[PDB]
Amino acid sequence: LLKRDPLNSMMNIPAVLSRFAGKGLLLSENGYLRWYVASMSIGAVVVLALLMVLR
Amino acid sequence: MEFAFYICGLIAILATLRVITHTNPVHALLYLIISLLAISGVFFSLGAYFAGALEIIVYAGAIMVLFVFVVMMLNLGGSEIEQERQWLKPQVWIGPAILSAIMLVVIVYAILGVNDQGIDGTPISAKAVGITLFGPYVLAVELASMLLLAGLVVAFHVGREE
Amino acid sequence: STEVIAHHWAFAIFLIVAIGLCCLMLVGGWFLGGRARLSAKFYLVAMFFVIFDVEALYLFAWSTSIRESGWVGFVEAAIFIFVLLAGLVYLVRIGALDWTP
Amino acid sequence: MTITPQNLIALLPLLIVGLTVVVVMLSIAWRRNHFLNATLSVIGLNAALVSLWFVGQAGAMDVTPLMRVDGFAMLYTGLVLLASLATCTFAYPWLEGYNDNKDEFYLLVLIAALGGILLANANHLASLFLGIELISLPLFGLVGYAFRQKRSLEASIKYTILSAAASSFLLFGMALVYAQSGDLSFVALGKNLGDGMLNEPLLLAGFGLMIVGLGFKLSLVPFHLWTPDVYQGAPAPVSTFLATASKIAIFGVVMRLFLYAPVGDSEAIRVVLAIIAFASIIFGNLMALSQTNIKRLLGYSSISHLGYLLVALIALQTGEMSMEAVGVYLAGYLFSSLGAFGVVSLMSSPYRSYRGLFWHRPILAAVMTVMMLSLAGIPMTLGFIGKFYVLAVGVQAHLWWLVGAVVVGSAIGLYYYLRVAVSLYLHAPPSNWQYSAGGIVVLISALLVLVLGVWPQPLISIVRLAMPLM
Amino acid sequence: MIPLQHGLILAAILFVLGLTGLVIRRNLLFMLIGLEIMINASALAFVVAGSYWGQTDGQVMYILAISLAAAEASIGLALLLQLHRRRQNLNIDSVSEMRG
Ligand SMILES: CCCCCCCCCCCCCCCCCC(=O)OC[C@H](COP(=O)(O)OCCN)OC(=O)CCCCCCCCCCCCCCCCC
Ligand SMILES: CCCCCCCCCCCCCCCCCC(=O)OC[C@H](COP(=O)(O)OCCN)OC(=O)CCCCCCCCCCCCCCCCC
Ligand SMILES: CCCCCCCCCCCCCCCCCC(=O)OC[C@H](COP(=O)(O)OCCN)OC(=O)CCCCCCCCCCCCCCCCC
């Protein structure tokens, strides 16, 4: 039962989590300029609203 | 003074709405010129006479002249990207509309809580702006000349025909 | 001061009567009578006009208040005009302002 | 404030660089000579670098309401000057492969360096805005220098549109901040508020719009999506310039603005910057696991390293050595990025795969893996000294989320940096003194990073000599 | 007699209209048009802020703003001319060859 080293897999969990999160984050870099401007405006709203709720 | 301010602001907002929702480049640029004349009216109603003068001289007299120039050079007419009216499909613009709406209302709510004694409309003359430009702000003048020269060089290098 | 508001009203009726006179002139012309690739040098010229018009507006702001700016303002605008003339000479020499081939 | 002769003495790099632009432009007007104009540009930049000694002898003083010359004014001016000189040195053999006009490149580099010196000495919203625009517009020209390429033209279009949007955002921010404050001086941004009313809605809104514009300028999340495409499409000397000089100057003026403004120690801005720093570190490390492109990889690397610098900036008021940490990190990051992008430029020169680089270009491969180890925070490198400084400043103000983000981002960045560093040594299927000069520049950067990793005391003392007006 | 708030709201409305026109339009000319709308809106806000305090610094930064707007419009229209010269179309979605 142990010959596959289960603890090594339990500590290899964050590696596969990092790869999945990186592949998910790479979906934003689609190469479209209109999406880049939209993301800049989205971040503007997020930063602005975070500043007013924590003011 | 105030009535001119509100009328020119309403004209500028309506003209900008017409620009961002039009299909003809020449009509859009004409509506933008109307908006710039209205914004110069806003400038003159607050006392910033030099600001409105430069708005009609170099913004509504040079830059949009260049836009109209490149529009008539490119022969923009019944193109494929223009005929489809993709920017008028509600599924396209509904996201950016509510995005600009939440940005606008956050900015509005931040603005509305500020102190305000009102703008007296005292005319800040162009002489005072010239005094300050060559007074405290001299390096701004020299390096803005350098900035315009850099833009000149860049736009020449990109825009050659060869 | 009734003179200032009088001049404002005079400007208002001057604007209105001029625009309306042109409007009714076009209207009367329509009403009466029976019936039965461009090169990039254009862009370069317009671009040079825009850039030198902004530098011109800087000189416009200078020239109205020359006396109280002193000699320091004069040497500042001397560097400004020298930069403008250097850029103009640079544009002339390379062939940017040469329309003929 | 008027101008005195000693105030002119304090502005030697600015006047020398502007005179260099005038002289090089008049020389191009005389005759298009690549070697002569490049030599004139590097002579002017070196003259500014030498005249920094006379500025140091002059002392710290305020020139106009716009500008203030002090220790970091000299430090960031010098860093921008080395970045511009290295950019010209890398650009010359690359420009030997250019069929079209080459002399405007050095003009744009000089003007962008002039904007960098502006941002170094800025003490005002006007000087900050003008320096940002003076960096951006020559970068618009330089990114799209080879506009016949799809990649360079597309990167120039993207950078131009997005930076105009960010400039309008930033200008609206200064407009709101000036409406609240009534003064554009750095020390007065929040001087009209007291008794715990620092969180003014309009002041926070304007400063948030400035954060939007500057986080575009510093590739901070979520204003970061332009970075890999612009880094990949631009010419490699240009990519070196946006990696080093623009980031250094914009972060220096950001550091001075947050130190001098009474609103810089607001809790809401601190929390927003902490969120942005966390997100930038994590994201800029996470999108770079699976990049086969070295330039996009270095763009995400720049995102993560600017997140680390933001982490150093957040503890400015609480900590005491936060600004010293920022200076040391920026020097080490400058040298590492200079070496890495110089190797990229040398394999990109002249104009017309890093795997197996050691078997034909061993010195370039060795300095490349040295700079990749530097960017990972590996010891015997200056990047480790910068990461140690950032960690120490994090434990100063107890920014434990940021410290843990630094650790995990360091691990992920270290993973892909080792991938590149060992792929250099695997197996896979010039001839002028300026190419040798660029190789000498990247080699000197490698020896500097190694020596100042083993012996970091001279750089620490140099940075500690850079103290502001309290 | 004219509130600072009302001019700030007008400038913000113009700014968000220019941003919306920048986002929803995939023709490059209308994106540049939106960029000039936003930079003119920020310049209008700066003029309103300067006129509220009775200082010429608002008009000075307006002058700097329109200098930037002129040079940036020149650069953007040169890039638009290059795009229309080499690709014969102004689709901003066509420039997407760099991704990932
Ligand atoms: C009539 C209903 C509407 C009809 C359709 C729209 C027509 C155009 C409306 C806009 C232009 C006119 C606005 C009304 C101006 C009336 C005059 C006025 O308000 O004068 C007061 C003041 C005089 O100057 P001041 O020294 O400040 O005096 C303060 C008094 N102690 O004035 C000021 O301080 C500033 C005055 C305004 C600025 C100068 C003029 C700007 C004109 C901009 C035109 C833009 C394009 C309009 C296109 C319309 C069609 C689409
Ligand atoms: C082809 C031709 C080639 C020519 C050679 C090119 C390469 C060499 C370039 C040399 C540049 C020299 C710059 C000298 C800067 C320091 C000048 C100086 O004397 O500063 C003294 C001053 C403090 O002195 P003090 O008189 O006490 O001041 C109190 C008065 N109020 O100190 C200060 O106020 C601050 C001093 C530090 C400011 C920053 C230092 C300059 C920038 C360094 C960037 C690189 C740093 C990383 C590398 C370090 C390597 C060890
Ligand atoms: C006792 C627990 C608490 C204390 C923890 C202290 C930290 C140190 C000890 C734990 C270290 C765990 C490291 C796990 C990953 C090890 C590296 C590895 O496996 O790399 C190889 C792997 C790719 O291998 P392959 O399967 O071939 O993937 C195909 C890729 N094209 O590569 C990948 O999949 C990508 C690797 C990315 C970088 C490594 C992952 C770093 C994640 C953060 C680590 C920090 C601790 C997080 C919390 C731990 C649990 C509490």
DSSP string covering D34-85, please?
Answer: HHHHHHHHHHHHHHHHHHHHHHHHH--EEETTTEEESHHHHHHHHHHHHHHH
DSSP D124: B
Residue B11, token pair as written in the block: 């004209």
Nearest to D241 by CA among D116, D148, D127, D152: D116
Beta-bridge partner residues of B141:
none
- Work out the number of other CB atoms within 10 angstroms of the CB of residue D264: 23
User: Could you report how far apart the first and last alpha carbons of chain D are, in Å?
Assistant: 20
- Work out the number of other CB atoms within 10 angstroms of the CB of residue B89: 11
The answer to whether D168 and E46 are in contact (CB under 8 A) is: no
The answer to whether E8 and B119 are in contact (CB under 8 A) is: no
Nearest to D55 by CA among D2, D103, D120, D101: D120
Within D145-196, residue ranges assigned H as helices are: 150-181
How many angstroms does the Cα of residue B162 sit away from the middle of ligand 1? 48
The CATH number covering residue B127 comes to 1.20.120.1200
Beta-bridge partner residues of B124:
B48
- CA count, 13 A, side-chain hemisphere, D149: 17
* Pairing state between β D61-63 and D67-69: antiparallel
Q: D455: helix, coil or strand?
A: coil
Residue D201, token pair as written in the block: 């809605």
The answer to whether E91 and A20 are in contact (CB under 8 A) is: no
- CA count, 13 A, side-chain hemisphere, D441: 29
DSSP C4: H
Please give the Cα distance from D210 to E40 (Å, whole number).
Answer: 17
Burial pattern D10-39, b for ≥16 Cβ within 10 A else e, equals bbbbbbbbbebbbbbbbbbbeeeebeebbb
Counting every residue written for chain B, the total comes to 162
How many angstroms does the Cα of residue B12 sit away from the middle of ligand 1? 13
Is the N-terminal amide bond of D222 cis, ω within 30° of 0?
yes
Please give the Cα distance from E88 to E64 (Å, whole number).
Answer: 34
Q: Are 3 or more Cβ–Cβ pairs between D and B shorter than 8 Å?
A: yes
Is the N-terminal amide bond of D237 cis, ω within 30° of 0?
no
All structural domains of chain E, each given as residue ranges with its CATH number in brackets, are 4-87 (1.10.287.3510)
Going from the C-alpha of D161 to that of each of A32, D39, D62, E77, the distances in angstroms are 12, 33, 35, 11
Sequence letter at residue B10:
L
Q: Which of E41, E75, E100 sits opposite D172 (nearest CB)?
A: E41
The answer to whether A48 and D306 are in contact (CB under 8 A) is: no
Q: D32: helix, coil or strand?
A: coil
Nearest to D86 by CA among D368, D442, D433: D442
The answer to whether D79 and D329 are in contact (CB under 8 A) is: no
How many angstroms does the Cα of residue D344 sit away from the middle of ligand 2? 29
Q: From the CB of D458, is ligand 2 less than 6 Å away?
A: yes
For this experimental structure, what is the resolution in angstroms?
A: 3.1
Going from the C-alpha of D243 to that of each of D136, D218, D298, the distances in angstroms are 13, 10, 9
Q: From the CB of D49, is ligand 2 less than 6 Å away?
A: yes
Residue A21 is part of which domain span? 1-53
DSSP character string of D398-416: T-HHHHHHHHHHHHHHHHH
DSSP E27: B
Positive or negative: CA dihedral B91, B96, B102, B105: negative
Asked if C87 and D3 come within 8 Å (Cβ–Cβ), the reply is no
Going from the C-alpha of D104 to that of each of A42, D100, D153, E75, the distances in angstroms are 37, 10, 17, 15
Sequence letter at residue A19:
R
Radius of gyration of chain A (CA): 19
- Work out the number of other CB atoms within 10 angstroms of the CB of residue D296: 23
Please give the Cα distance from D110 to D39 (Å, whole number).
Answer: 12
Residue partners of D103: CB distance under 8 A and separation at least 6: D24, D28, D32, D33, D34, D37
DSSP E90: -
Q: Give, in degrees to the nearest 5, the angle at Cα D264 between D183 and D124.
A: 35
What's phi and psi for D67, nearest 5 deg?
Answer: -125, 155
Q: Tokens 């930038």 map to which residue?
A: D280
The answer to whether D358 and D365 are in contact (CB under 8 A) is: yes
- Most distant CA pair in chain B: distance in Å? 58
User: Could you report how far apart the first and last alpha carbons of chain B are, in Å?
Assistant: 52
B-C contacts at Cβ under 8 angstroms: 101
Please give the Cα distance from B43 to D243 (Å, whole number).
Answer: 40
Residue B82, token pair as written in the block: 């223009």
What's phi and psi for D293, nearest 5 deg?
Answer: -100, 125
Please give the Cα distance from E44 to E66 (Å, whole number).
Answer: 11
Cβ burial, residue C8 (10 Å; 0-12/13-18/19+) = exposed
The CATH number covering residue A35 comes to 1.20.5.2700
Q: D201: helix, coil or strand?
A: helix
Q: Which residues of D touch C72 (CB under 8 A)?
A: 2-3
Domain count, chain A: 1
Nearest to E76 by CA among E39, E27, E31: E31
Q: From the CB of A15, is ligand 3 less than 6 Å away?
A: yes
Q: Which residues of D touch A20 (CB under 8 A)?
A: none
- Identify from E20, E96, E97, E98 which residue to disrupt to test chain A contact, counting A C-beta atoms within 10 A and taking the largest count: E96
Please state the separation of Cα D28 from the chain's center in Å.
29
Residue D117, token pair as written in the block: 């010196």
* Experiment used for this model: cryo-EM
Q: From the CB of B4, is ligand 1 less than 6 Å away?
A: yes
Q: Which residues of B touch D201 (CB under 8 A)?
A: 109-111, 113-114
Nearest to D234 by CA among D134, D307, D153, D294: D153
Q: D1: helix, coil or strand?
A: coil
Q: D103: helix, coil or strand?
A: coil
Nearest to B144 by CA among D133, D43, D194: D133
Please give the Cα distance from D31 to D26 (Å, whole number).
Answer: 9
Q: After which residues is chain E broken (C to N over 2.5 A)?
A: none
Residue B102, token pair as written in the block: 């939440």
Please state the separation of Cα B149 from the chain's center in Å.
22
User: Could you report how far apart the first and last alpha carbons of chain A are, in Å?
Assistant: 56
Please give the Cα distance from B34 to B11 (Å, whole number).
Answer: 8
Write down the CATH number for the domain with range C10-100: 1.20.58.1610
Beta-bridge partner residues of B119:
E2
Residue D272, token pair as written in the block: 């927003």
The secondary element (H helix, E strand) that includes residue D374 is helix D362-375
Please give the Cα distance from E43 to E4 (Å, whole number).
Answer: 14
Please give the Cα distance from E56 to D18 (Å, whole number).
Answer: 27
Beta-bridge partner residues of D185:
D124
Cα dihedral: C25, C27, C29, C30 (round 10): 160
Q: Which residues of D touch C82 (CB under 8 A)?
A: 22
Sequence letter at residue D240:
T
Q: From the CB of D408, is ligand 3 less than 6 Å away?
A: yes
Residue E64, token pair as written in the block: 């700097």
The answer to whether E81 and E28 are in contact (CB under 8 A) is: no
Nearest to D384 by CA among D294, D309, D284, D452: D452
Please give the Cα distance from D50 to D38 (Å, whole number).
Answer: 18
Please give the Cα distance from A48 to B104 (Å, whole number).
Answer: 11
The answer to whether D276 and A46 are in contact (CB under 8 A) is: no
Residue A46, token pair as written in the block: 């997020």
B-D contacts at Cβ under 8 angstroms: 90
Minimal C-alpha gap between A7 and chain D (Å) = 20
Helix (DSSP H) and strand (DSSP E) numbers for chain E: 3, 0
Q: Tokens 């940036």 map to which residue?
A: E72
Nearest ligand (C-alpha, residue D45)? 2
Please state the separation of Cα D141 from the chain's center in Å.
18
How many angstroms does the Cα of residue D77 sit away from the middle of ligand 2? 10
Residue B145, token pair as written in the block: 């000349």
Cβ burial, residue B16 (10 Å; 0-12/13-18/19+) = buried
Q: E70: helix, coil or strand?
A: helix
The answer to whether D285 and D304 are in contact (CB under 8 A) is: yes
Please give the Cα distance from D158 to E95 (Å, whole number).
Answer: 9
Going from the C-alpha of B145 to that of each of B10, C49, C53, C82, D128, the distances in angstroms are 35, 14, 11, 11, 16
